[PDB]
Amino acid sequence: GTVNWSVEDIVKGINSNNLESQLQATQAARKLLSREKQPPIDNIIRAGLIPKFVSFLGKTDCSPIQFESAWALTNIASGTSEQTKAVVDGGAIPAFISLLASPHAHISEQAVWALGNIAGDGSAFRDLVIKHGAIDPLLALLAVPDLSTLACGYLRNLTWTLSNLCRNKNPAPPLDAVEQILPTLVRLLHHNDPEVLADSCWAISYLTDGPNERIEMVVKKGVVPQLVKLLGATELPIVTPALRAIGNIVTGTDEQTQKVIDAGALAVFPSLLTNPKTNIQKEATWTMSNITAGRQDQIQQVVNHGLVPFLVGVLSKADFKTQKEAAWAITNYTSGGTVEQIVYLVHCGIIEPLMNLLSAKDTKIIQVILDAISNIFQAAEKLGETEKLSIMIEECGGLDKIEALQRHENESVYKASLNLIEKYFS
Amino acid sequence: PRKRPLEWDEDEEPPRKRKRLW
Numbered sequence: 001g002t003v004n005w006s007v008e009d010i011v012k013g014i015n016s017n018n019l020e021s022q023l024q025a026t027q028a029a030r031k032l033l034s035r036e037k038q039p040p041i042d043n044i045i046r047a048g049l050i051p052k053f054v055s056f057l058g059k060t061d062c063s064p065i066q067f068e069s070a071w072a073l074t075n076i077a078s079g080t081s082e083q084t085k086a087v088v089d090g091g092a093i094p095a096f097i098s099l100l101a102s103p104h105a106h107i108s109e110q111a112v113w114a115l116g117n118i119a120g121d122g123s124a125f126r127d128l129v130i131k132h133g134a135i136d137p138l139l140a141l142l143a144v145p146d147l148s149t150l151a152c153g154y155l156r157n158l159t160w161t162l163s164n165l166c167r168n169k170n171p172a173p174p175l176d177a178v179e180q181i182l183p184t185l186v187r188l189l190h191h192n193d194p195e196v197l198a199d200s201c202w203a204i205s206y207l208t209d210g211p212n213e214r215i216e217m218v219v220k221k222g223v224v225p226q227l228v229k230l231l232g233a234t235e236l237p238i239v240t241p242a243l244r245a246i247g248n249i250v251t252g253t254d255e256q257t258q259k260v261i262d263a264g265a266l267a268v269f270p271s272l273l274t275n276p277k278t279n280i281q282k283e284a285t286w287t288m289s290n291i292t293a294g295r296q297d298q299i300q301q302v303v304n305h306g307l308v309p310f311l312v313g314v315l316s317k318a319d320f321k322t323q324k325e326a327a328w329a330i331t332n333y334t335s336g337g338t339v340e341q342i343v344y345l346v347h348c349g350i351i352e353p354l355m356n357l358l359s360a361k362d363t364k365i366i367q368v369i370l371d372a373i374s375n376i377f378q379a380a381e382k383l384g385e386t387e388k389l390s391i392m393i394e395e396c397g398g399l400d401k402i403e404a405l406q407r408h409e410n411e412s413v414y415k416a417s418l419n420l421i422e423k424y425f426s
Numbered sequence: 427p428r429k430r431p432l433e434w435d436e437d438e439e440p441p442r443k444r445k446r447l448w
Binding site: 033034036039071074075077078079084110113116117120121160163164167198199202240241247250251252279282283286289290292293325328331332335336 | 427428430432435438439440441442443445446447448
């Protein structure tokens, strides 16, 4: 009988000061707010119901109204920032945090969920949840000998909320909050549930999304090898964030990048660089480009793992965004590599697919490619083989393309294309 | 050579907020 009430009926029941009447009206609100299509969130807010729901959260003597109000508030907080704000403005944060201590699992779970929605709004509400002291009691819920004893849905909700507490930038989460949460994240990273693993990998992705100091906090926990293992998972929803985290780490120092290599990450790239999921191939190629921007010994590891042919492959055929990352990978390679490494690159067949991409109308990739060709020519100069190279480029139709780029709209483009022709083609 | 960031495809990420349906 709590199905399809009007907001007016709900207000009447909640204002009755009959606890049972209040419970029934709150449940009716929960059901209204639970419908997928246009729940009357703003109407509930305007009716002034939020403070009432928040008050009901504190009714330890009536667990059902605690649960119903927690659920109702959760769904209001799942809306726009303004709707989440109305929940926060009603004093919900400390009330939900107190509910984390409820002896009723379904109730503490609902509080976890609601706090996830609030923190998920952005860095301000995230940090406000942290300031109210949510982390300790959240982490306490996970303090058991074996995660497997927790209900699956329960652990998934907790993991997700924790990941939202690691989420967002400007600013990033407080350093001490991150240190507090990390050890639990590391443990979750070793759990066997696919959804827990996915969200945990996303959490690590957020945390490594910043300057080297932020990256270092994660790497020093020793999680890199586990992330590399997760790179090989069959579940693509695990691979995506695992690879994002790994990619974030190699944007750091040479030493942080080396940890990724030492952990054996490169052995997985033959598969990642040919992955049928476009976005995985893209971030795999992005990751490669940051590794080829590393030291010569790190470029050499790329060579040893046979990944150059895979980069030629991606450059030859892939989604355009991926090809652009491949272009960057090649320019970095040619920029930081030895003459021998550059010779090897050309021998792998890089030239033709490079020239073919000059046909694209993205001004940046053209710049990247022209820079790569200059780098390769510099290497040929040291070998006095600049003539072999010029012939290579002309035979696959590169000369024709480079010549036309002399007339290019863009500044740096027609310039550099001019230096090339003037310098090695006349 | 510089190290570079990569755009974040939001549709790949966990939801920021979740409505409980049942």
